[PDB]
Automatic annotation (TrEMBL), chain C:
Organism (species): Sus scrofa
Residues of the full protein shown: 38 to 104 of 105
Membrane topology: Peripheral membrane protein
Major localization listed first in the record, in broad terms: mitochondrion
Protein name: NADH dehydrogenase [ubiquinone] 1 beta subcomplex subunit 2, mitochondrial
Function: Accessory subunit of the mitochondrial membrane respiratory chain NADH dehydrogenase (Complex I), that is believed not to be involved in catalysis. Complex I functions in the transfer of electrons from NADH to the respiratory chain. The immediate electron acceptor for the enzyme is believed to be ubiquinone.
Keyword Plastid listed: no
From TrEMBL, chain D:
A GO biological-process term: mitochondrial electron transport, NADH to ubiquinone
Originating organism: Sus scrofa
Quaternary data: Complex I is composed of 45 different subunits.
Keywords from the named record: Acetylation, Electron transport, Membrane, Mitochondrion, Mitochondrion inner membrane, Respiratory chain, Transmembrane, Transmembrane helix, Transport
Protein name in UniProt: NADH dehydrogenase [ubiquinone] 1 beta subcomplex subunit 6
Subcellular location, principal: mitochondrion
This protein's GO CC annotations: mitochondrial inner membrane
Keyword hit for Acetylation: yes
UniProtKB/TrEMBL annotation, chain E:
NAD is among the record's keywords: no
Family: Belongs to the acyl carrier protein (ACP) family.
Subcellular location: Mitochondrion
Native source species: Sus scrofa
The protein's name in its UniProt record: Acyl carrier protein
BP terms from Gene Ontology: fatty acid biosynthetic process
Chief location of this protein within or outside the cell: mitochondrion
UniProtKB/TrEMBL annotation, chain G:
Recorded name of the encoding gene: NDUFB7
UniProt-recorded name of the protein: NADH dehydrogenase [ubiquinone] 1 beta subcomplex subunit 7
Keyword S-adenosyl-L-methionine: no
Organism the protein comes from: Sus scrofa (Pig)
Disulphides: C58-C89, C68-C79
GO molecular function, one term: NADH dehydrogenase (ubiquinone) activity
Length: 459, 178, 67, 98, 88, 80, 124, 110, 128
């Protein structure tokens, strides 16, 4: 699959050899071309994966994620060139280099056949993200956010490494195919319980799980717009992909080791949906929305059924697109008024009608309106949970109401009412921002047209 | 809405407000015109019976009983004018009110239409720009040294002055803008 | 059709609206009368409701309190 | 009671300015300078859609089993079948409670 | 269409019409600039009743703080004109 | 277009319930100074209005005449 | 309904119970009873697809009414004889049901009174 | 129900539009003669809503009531249905009486 | 004389029913004067920038900034572990989790016990 990896490593020197005023054009054009190339991975089989070599393979679960990453890179490039206009040429090239390196690490992570290689790449993704957050963030909290982003990850991932090597000294292989075929049940002992915890906690903290999520609001609020985009749409799905991969060796311990995490996921989904109802920061509201959706995904992965896995895959794809769109929509208003408070700029539908339409579509998709893929994933997960236990329909149902409320709340706070009188610097929407919104929203409904592409291997 | 409020309401002001509220709610109770006129005359006589009370304490005590009686006997669903703060059309047209500064961002193709309107707009903007320094100086002169004590603003007194802080009052969007 | 305000007088009425209103009221009443003349059973009932107490024991088959 | 002279004078001046501003909102006769068959509805909105729909249902939808399922027609005594020609017997010699 | 574009002359005519139906004022003695307490000898209750009559006639409410200040028919006409964006 | 208000002295409370209100207020020593302002709602073409039963049976006469004609024709059309 | 007042306020011991009814043998009071017959075949009602609730003892009149309705389609006011026949059949069915209700009430009250009288006679 | 409910709402909207977007029946005077066609339509719709015989509302509401009368059903539900079908005529009478009969109560600019 | 109206949290007392505004004394009038003076000074400070022809952007309001900072960043530095805080945190953060765990564990145990005995009527239950 080097036909995708090599063009990114070629994006690197092309950016570093570009003329000072042509970096954005070249980067965007060739990133779009790389996305078009990566579109060919959607042609999957029904029985096994695409085993390209001893190192890399593609599956029906990782191909949509790869397509989403390669599609997200150009969107980040367009969203970044506004607030980086005054930067020097060298620092702009460094920023683009960080973005390209992040894409390369994510591409190699989603296709690694080996669990230690997966760990190495899934840990290497931290350095570009941390550098971006702590160098190009705007306020003084960013430094603290970086620390919160770093150690929260590492404290979860360092035990996993130990567990991984332990497994390789017992079974002799960490290759995913051999691991799947030579799978054996896990007994009920304290050592197996702690091995389960070591294998699970890293991906549960990257989701993030409720109670372990405190890093996410900081990281997604103090980051630049591209950083928030990549953190919310792709980097949160590393936990889901890793859990879906690693759960093949944890049965039947999961059958009873999932209870605390299931309880945390459901109650914290309710809790974060409620938190969204009282939020003075517009970016924090989107961050907590991400927390709630990822709690739903955690439940789906933890109950371990084919319908749950299908719904979880669809929900990850839909959430990535939707949250990236919401972050960009909030960043437009921030760039206009230089403040993140939701009740500062009001009645924006009067001043920006097409932006109000984009806001309406994003909010309608966030609350899982049929037949959007958000709804497909949510409904599949809810049906699987109902099969798991009939009482869950209470909590899930509760969430379905609360989400809608806060979603429309945001819209009604930002677009309706009367405009603030003293704010007179609201210029007409640029073609770049409208194109960004359209390129976010059109793929969502296009995938709604053909939903089996994002339903995962269990389809 | 146009007048600057005071630090407090006088006794006479409170009595007048209670009289108006009682009349309106009684009209809400008495739908027909002749019945309303009858009971409004009765209410007027009831009000002017105690008009000549020299004891202020007893006057405010009578007002207290009047407010208690009104709150007990108020109409639960009083008539509200459609554009009043409780009416069915209170803020119906606020979505059509667009601030004037938006016109500063129109494309030159849009400004190619309506040339004379934009010429008049340029004249108004120039007048505001010339006027601003004087408006600030007048407010500086007329202000007591311990800051303003009310929200009232002075008029223009000089030969060709303009009343200070006039731009956003004069250029209100409209009552029926679109 | 131009109709101007009146300020405390009865509004101006065109003949067409009065003709339409009277015609439709008349057609409603004619329809009601015609349908009642032809479908009285729909309102007054069609079959006589029998009372039970005038049914003899012979057709109801109850014994004379002896066996 | 009433206004004080300052409020009256300020209201007069603001009123003059506001009436001037509202007079300026008017349009001169040239302001909108614009820069430089009968039954066709029944054809483009009924005939064309029904042609496409009929073609799609006749040659694509009904090319698969159970795509357009129609409930069985009601058969009454004394009827004759179109294909088999079978006639249905009558109904058991009504007691005739006339 | 909708209601005609109310003018200053129409507003003044309507206000004077309403005032001339009041039994406590003499129609001959009443003028556009006549004061309610000074020239006409009314008290505050009569002024409240006059404001309520104007509210009924034009179909919109005048706040008490603003209604306390209108003392002559010209002031009432001016307040109505500024409220309804009438300039001719 | 270009219409003036009717003359103000044609409005009188005589012959209206406002007269009854004035008489009842006179017996208590009171007075109603606003009756002429309300007289227009009773003076002109609003002088009289139907009752509820009169309103419900709006077009009963014409419809009943038509019904009688139709039934008479039916009675002499079955004689064919 | 008056029967409701009789059952709920008066002695409910002698009043028929709609849920549990009839409580006497069908041949108890009558010397012999005729078996109620049907005119419509099961296949006939199946072909007509009436309802599971319209396949009562008056189904033949309903079938004839539906057939005449279909045959006289544009003239939707021509099948009045058939509708009248169906209505008369259902009216007779309801009359039969009321007769059963009264038979049960009379049997209940007579049986209980006779049992009380026999018990009193055996108690003296 | 669709027919007469929609046309009753259309008549109410016509009244509202004529009287300068006024919706309160207390300020709606005598419109029986001022709005002849609207009065005719509203009267016919009110009679249809109350199940006056041989109108559109008769053929459904009459059968519904006579069917709840003949069923093994909750007694409280039957009583509440009867009281509600009385209150229906009650509020239709309220609308007609307050909106069309009597003397005008709207602002003098007609 | 008439039935009395007693206020609540979600239905507060009207101004005209307030005894406190019907017995006034000069220091109350002085306090109202200073309140109006503060309001007028803030209004003038706002309106001077609002009408400035050279002002482009957002008029910064320290009240909004203070409100958001108090709601977001000032909370932890002013936190003390007290019996009230500890008890409320333990309750609201632990009780719901164990309640839902008990409910779902009981339901799933009952369902599994029904499955083992072979009496749950799982016919047509293909998709899970
Ligand atoms: C069933 C309808 C079939 C319609 C056939 C044609 C469909 C064309 C779809 C075009 C692609 C979507 C574009 C979305 C972005 C908007 C683009 C834009 O800026 O337009 C401005 C343009 C110019 O206007 P303007 O003057 O600039 O106005 C700007 C102001 O802000 C003023 O703005 P505004 O006030 O006009 O706001 C725009 C307008 C419309 O704008 C939008 O809301 C667009 C997004 C709609 C919501 C999407 C989220 C929900 C998930 C639906 C997923 C469906 C995907 C299907 C495949 C789509 C592939 C692209 O707002 C609304 O009308 C309400 C929106 C909510 C609609 C709720 C519908 C519920 C579901 C209905 C059924 C959906 C499934 C159908 C199949 C069911 C089984 C048969 O106006 C238009 O071009 C028309 C607007 C589009 C209306 C389409 C709504 C119905 C279509 C539903 C999806 C398409 C289905 C097609 C297959 C048949 C099914
Ligand atoms: C802030 C959010 C962070 C994320 C939270 C992650 C949740 C992690 C919780 C771990 C889940 C379960 C752990 C162990 C499994 C069973 C737990 C125990 O209570 O069950 C009984 C265990 O019995 C007793 O409970 C003994 C354990 C008591 C000591 C454990 C300390 C618990 C204190 C809780 C502290 C909070 C931990 C989290 C710190 C952050 C079962 O009886 P037993 O059959 O014998 O043990 C089964 C194992 N066998 C088969 C080998 C024998
Ligand atoms: C609908 C159900 C609610 C019914 C509520 C109504 C019932 C309450 C009616 C009785 C209440 C009273 O009269 S309370 C009587 C209060 N007593 C006084 O006011 C004595 C001092 N006089 C003055 O203040 C002025 O002369 C003034 C009177 C304001 C005139 O103002 P002007 O001359 O300068 O216009």
């Amino acid at each position: 699959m080097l036909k995708i990896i090599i063009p990114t490593t070629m994006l690197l020197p092309m950016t570093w050899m570009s003329k000072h005023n042509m970096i954005w054009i070249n980067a965007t054009v060739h990133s779009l071309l790389i996305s078009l190339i990566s579109l060919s991975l959607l042609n999957q089989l029904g029985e096994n994966s695409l085993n390209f070599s001893l190192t890399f393979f593609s599956d029906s679960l990782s191909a949509p994620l790869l397509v989403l990453t390669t599609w997200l890179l150009p969107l980040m490039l367009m969203a970044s060139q506004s607030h980086l206009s005054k930067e020097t040429t060298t620092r702009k090239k460094l920023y683009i280099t960080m973005l390209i390196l992040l894409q390369l690490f994510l591409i190699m992570t989603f296709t690694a056949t080996e669990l230690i290689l997966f760990y190495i790449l899934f840990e290497a993704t931290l350095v570009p993200t941390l550098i971006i957050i702590t160098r190009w963030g705007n306020q003084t909290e960013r430094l603290n956010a970086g620390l919160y982003f770093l150690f929260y990850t590492l404290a979860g991932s360092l035990p996993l490494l130990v567990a991984l090597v332990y497994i390789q000294n017992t079974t002799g292989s960490l290759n995913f195919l051999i691991i799947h075929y030579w799978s054996h049940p896990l007994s009920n002992s304290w050592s197996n319980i702690f091995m389960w915890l070591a294998c699970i906690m890293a991906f549960m903290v990257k989701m993030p799980l409720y109670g372990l999520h405190l890093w996410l609001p900081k990281a997604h609020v103090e980051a630049p717009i591209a950083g928030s985009m990549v953190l919310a749409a792709v980097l949160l799905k590393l936990g889901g992909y890793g859990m879906m991969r690693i759960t093949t060796i944890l049965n039947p311990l999961t059958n009873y080791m999932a209870y605390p995490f299931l309880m945390l996921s459901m109650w914290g989904m309710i809790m974060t949906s409620s938190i969204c109802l009282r939020q003075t920061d517009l970016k924090s509201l989107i961050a907590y929305s991400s927390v709630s959706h990822m709690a739903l995904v955690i439940v789906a992965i933890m109950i371990q059924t084919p319908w749950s896995f299908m719904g979880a895959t669809a929900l990850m794809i839909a959430h990535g697109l939707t949250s990236s769109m919401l972050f960009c929509l909030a960043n437009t208003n921030y760039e206009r008024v230089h403040s993140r408070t939701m009740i500062l700029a009001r009645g924006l539908q009067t001043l920006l009608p097409l932006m109000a339409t984009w806001w309406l579509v994003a909010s309608l998709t966030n609350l899982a309106l049929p037949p959007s893929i958000n709804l497909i994933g949510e409904l599949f997960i809810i049906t699987a949970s109902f099969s798991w236990s009939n009482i869950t329909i209470i909590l899930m149902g509760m969430n379905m109401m609360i989400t809608a409320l806060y979603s429309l709340y945001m819209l009604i706070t930002t677009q309706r009412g009367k405009y603030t009188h003293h704010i007179n610097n609201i210029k007409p929407s640029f073609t770049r921002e409208n194109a960004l919104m359209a390129l976010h929203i059109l793929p969502l409904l296009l995938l709604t047209l053909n939903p089996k592409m994002i339903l995962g291997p269990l389809y | 809405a146009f007048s600057a409020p005071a630090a407090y309401l006088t006794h006479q002001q409170k009595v007048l407000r209670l009289y108006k509220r009682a009349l309106r709610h009684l009209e809400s109770w008495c739908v027909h015109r002749d019945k309303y006129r009858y009971f409004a005359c009765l209410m007027r006589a009831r009000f002017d019976e105690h008009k000549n009370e020299k004891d202020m304490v007893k006057a405010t005590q009578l007002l207290r009983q009047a407010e208690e009686e009104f709150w007990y006997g108020q109409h639960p669903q009083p008539y509200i004018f459609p554009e009043s703060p409780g009416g069915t059309s209170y803020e119906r047209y606020e979505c059509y009110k667009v601030p004037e500064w938006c016109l500063d961002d129109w494309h030159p193709s849009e400004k190619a239409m309506y040339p004379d309107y934009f010429a008049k707009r340029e004249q108004w903007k120039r007048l505001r720009r010339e006027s601003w320094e004087r408006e600030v100086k007048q407010l500086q002169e007329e202000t007591p040294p311990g800051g303003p004590r009310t929200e009232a603003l002075p008029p223009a007194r000089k030969e060709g002055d303009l009343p200070p802080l006039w731009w956003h009052i004069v250029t209100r969007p409209r009552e029926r803008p679109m | 059709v131009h109709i101007e305000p009146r300020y405390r007088q009865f509004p101006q009425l065109t003949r067409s609206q009065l003709i339409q209103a009277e015609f439709f009221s008349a057609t409603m009443w004619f329809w009601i009368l015609w349908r009642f003349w032809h479908d009285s059973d729909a309102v007054l009932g069609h079959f006589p409701y029998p009372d039970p107490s005038q049914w003899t024991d012979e057709e109801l088959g109850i014994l004379p309190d002896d066996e | 009671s009433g206004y004080t002279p300052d409020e009256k004078l300020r209201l007069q001046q603001l009123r003059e300015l506001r009436r001037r501003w509202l007079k300026d909102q008017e349009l001169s006769p040239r302001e909108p300078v614009l820069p430089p068959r009968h039954s066709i509805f029944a054809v483009t909105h009924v005939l064309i859609p029904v042609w496409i729909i009929h073609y799609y249902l006749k040659y694509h939808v009904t090319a698969k089993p159970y795509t357009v399922v129609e409930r069985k027609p009601r058969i009454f005594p004394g009827d004759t079948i179109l294909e088999t020609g079978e006639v249905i017997p009558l109904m058991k010699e009504f007691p005739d409670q006339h | 269409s909708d209601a005609p574009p109310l003018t200053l002359e129409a507003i003044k005519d309507r206000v004077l019409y309403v005032l001339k139906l009041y039994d406590k004022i003499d129609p001959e003695k009443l003028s556009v600039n006549s004061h309610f307490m000074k020239d006409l000898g009314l008290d505050s209750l009569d002024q409240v009743e006059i404001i309520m009559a104007m509210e009924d006639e034009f179909g919109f409410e005048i706040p008490d703080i603003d209604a306390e200040k209108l003392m002559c028919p010209q002031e009432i006409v001016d307040y109505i004109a500024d409220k309804k964006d009438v300039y001719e | 277009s270009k219409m003036e208000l009717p003359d103000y002295k044609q409005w009188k409370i005589e012959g209206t319930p406002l007269e009854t209100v004035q008489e009842k207020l006179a017996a208590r020593g009171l007075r109603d100074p606003w009756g002429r302002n309300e007289a227009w709602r009773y003076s002109g073409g609003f002088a009289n209005n139907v009752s509820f039963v009169g309103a419900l049976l709006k077009g009963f006469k014409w419809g009943f005449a038509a019904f009688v004609v139709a039934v008479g024709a039916e009675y002499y059309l079955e004689s064919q | 309904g008056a029967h409701l007042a009789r059952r709920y306020l008066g002695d409910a011991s002698k009043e028929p119970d709609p849920l549990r009814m009839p409580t006497f043998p069908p041949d108890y009071g009558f010397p012999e009873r005729k078996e109620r017959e049907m005119v419509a075949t099961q296949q006939e009602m199946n072909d007509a697809q009436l309802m599971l609730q319209q396949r009562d003892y008056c189904a033949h009149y309903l079938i004839q009414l539906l057939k005449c309705k279909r045959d006289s389609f544009p003239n939707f006011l021509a099948c009045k004889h058939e509708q009248h026949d169906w209505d008369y059949c259902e009216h007779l069915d309801y009359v039969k049901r009321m007769k059963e209700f009264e038979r049960e009430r009379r049997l209940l009250q007579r049986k209980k009174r006779r049992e009380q009288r026999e018990a009193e006679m055996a108690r003296g | 129900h669709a027919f007469f409910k929609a046309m009753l709402f259309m008549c109410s909207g016509s009244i509202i539009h004529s009287l300068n977007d006024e919706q309160d029946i207390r300020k709606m005077g005598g419109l029986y003669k001022a709005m002849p066609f609207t009065t005719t339509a509203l009267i016919i719709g009110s009679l249809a809503l109350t199940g006056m015989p041989y109108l559109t509302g008769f053929y459904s509401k009459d059968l519904i009531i006579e069917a709840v009368n003949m069923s093994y059903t909750n007694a409280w539900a039957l009583l509440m249905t009867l009281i509600a079908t009385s209150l229906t005529a009650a509020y239709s009478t309220r609308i007609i009486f307050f909106a069309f009969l009597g003397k005008p109560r709207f602002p003098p600019l007609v | 004389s008439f039935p009395k109206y007693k206020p609540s949290r979600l239905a507060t007392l009207p101004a005209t029913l307030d005894p406190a505004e019907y017995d006034i004394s000069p220091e109350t009038r002085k306090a109202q004067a200073e309140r109006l003076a503060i309001r007028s000074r803030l209004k003038r400070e706002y309106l001077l920038q609002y009408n400035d022809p050279n002002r482009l952007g957002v008029i910064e309001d320290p009240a909004l900034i203070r409100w958001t900072y108090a709601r977001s960043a000032n909370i932890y530095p002013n936190f003390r572990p007290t019996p009230k805080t500890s008890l409320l945190g333990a309750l609201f953060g632990i009780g719901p989790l164990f309640f839902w765990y008990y409910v779902f564990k009981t339901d799933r145990d009952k369902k599994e016990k029904l499955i083992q005995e072979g009496k749950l009527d799982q016919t047509f239950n293909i998709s899970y």
